[PDB]
Amino acid sequence: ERTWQDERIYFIMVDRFNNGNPKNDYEVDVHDPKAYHGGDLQGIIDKLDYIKEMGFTAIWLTPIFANEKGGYHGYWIEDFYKVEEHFGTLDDFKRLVKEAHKRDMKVILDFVVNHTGYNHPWLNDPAKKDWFHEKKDIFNWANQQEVENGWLFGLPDLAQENPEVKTYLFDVAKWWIQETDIDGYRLDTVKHVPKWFWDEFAKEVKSVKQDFFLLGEVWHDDPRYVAEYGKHGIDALIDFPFYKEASTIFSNVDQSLEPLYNVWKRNVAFYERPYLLGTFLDNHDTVRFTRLALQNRINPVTRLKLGLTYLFSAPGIPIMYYGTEIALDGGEDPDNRRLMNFRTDKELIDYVTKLGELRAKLPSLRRGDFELLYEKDGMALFKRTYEKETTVIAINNTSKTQKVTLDGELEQGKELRGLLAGDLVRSKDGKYDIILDRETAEIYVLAPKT
Ligand SMILES: OC[C@H]1O[C@H](O[C@H]2[C@H](O)[C@@H](O)[C@@H](O)O[C@@H]2CO)[C@H](O)[C@@H](O)[C@@H]1O
Ligand SMILES: [Ca+2]
Ligand SMILES: [Ca+2]
Ligand SMILES: [Ca+2]
Ligand SMILES: [Ca+2]
């Protein structure tokens, strides 16, 4: 049966994906990095087959609720019960969900509880003074209550301690679920909101949809800090510790993969559900992984193939930011949120398709254990086993041809059939000699000798 461990997520910033209706292009200006660029819900529906053909099983949309001026990204909300006018209507969104569901795809909406836009009407309502915390900047970030009570980036910080605010938020959470039949929320700014709140929130949204999925963004690289939030009703967490290592290691050649395995081991140590961690090479808040490769003066296509190979073969829930599949460039926010281009070379689109198909086909890649057999200076072998399937993931992140011999770590008398690139390694006297040319990868299934 399908579980969230089995899912692959395609992550989209609505305004920056596909402008499928030019008639809602209000003040659009593609040459202003802080304007709306036109991407909308019709654009998303038009590309669902594109997304599915890459092997993606779910989509995550940045927030669709009406924003104030300047809020192209969706995080400066003006009305919690309205679809943003640039993106479409409520009916256009219900059709998106129906069309995703027709293709067996899940829909995750980005959901904000922490704050409103700078100019939300509530700020003028004398009866709403107590809906917001005192207007203060966050200074001591080691003070968790200051982090929870301060105005993040000057954004009006909602007071969940007020039961009217809490009820409003639960009410709206439940409404979108009941009205549009979405499958989950990606929860923004989870660490700026107190833990007791998430326990109650979780209980509310699953009371209306038993299997409703929550993915928490807890922006921190310490897994002990992040994992505490999984005890408060949030199913899955964004893996910033994975990201930190994967972005760095795969953006240049001749770098050790071992820190990624320690990320795993630490995930098993600290989290209740270590397969339910969202893994990624970049996102809408980081520099593009392509930019990291460019900065290192090295071919980004090659870097992405190795990184994506790891992403689609390691534990977790892969989350691929729109544009990864065309090596879309971009520096810091807002330059990491460039309009998508659908008319490029297809090399990475096809590669990603292969990887998504292999992750779907090979249950060891979704549910297997995860063992490190060998790692030296970027040359890595991993093993995964699920029931009677054994897979070996070989990533040569070195600038040399590498030969590694396994002798004991695999059952003798068999062969490793390469499913990514067609390699074949037969057991010779109980040994498997694995050869990979520089900056290549292969995913092998252990099978009878042919
Ligand atoms: O105006 C400040 C800031 O707000 C938004 O940032 C988001 C971020 O994208 C989320 O993933 C998360 O960390 O919460 C933030 C606040 O909701 C905009 O995305 C950003 O461009 C802007 O500077
Ligand atoms: Ca449009
Ligand atoms: Ca608006
Ligand atoms: Ca807060
Ligand atoms: Ca080693």
UniProtKB/TrEMBL annotation:
Domain (Glycosyl hydrolase family 13 catalytic) spans: 11-359
Cofactor(s) demanded: Ca(2+)
What is an example of a GO molecular function annotated in this UniProt entry?
calcium ion binding
Protein's GO biological process: carbohydrate metabolic process
Q: Which Pfam families match?
A: Alpha-amylase (PF00128), Alpha-amylase_C_2 (PF22026)
Entry EC no(s): 3.2.1.1
State the reactions this protein catalyses: Endohydrolysis of (1->4)-alpha-D-glucosidic linkages in polysaccharides containing three or more (1->4)-alpha-linked D-glucose units
Does this UniProt record's set of keywords contain Disulfide bond? no
- For the ligand (Ca(2+) 3), the binding residues are N114, E148, D157, H192
Q: Which residues bind Ca(2+) 1?
A: N19, N21, N24, D25, G38, D40
Q: Which residues bind Ca(2+) 4?
A: E375
The answer to keyword Calcium applying to this record is yes
**Family under the similarity heading:** Belongs to the glycosyl hydrolase 13 family.
The name on file for this protein is alpha-amylase
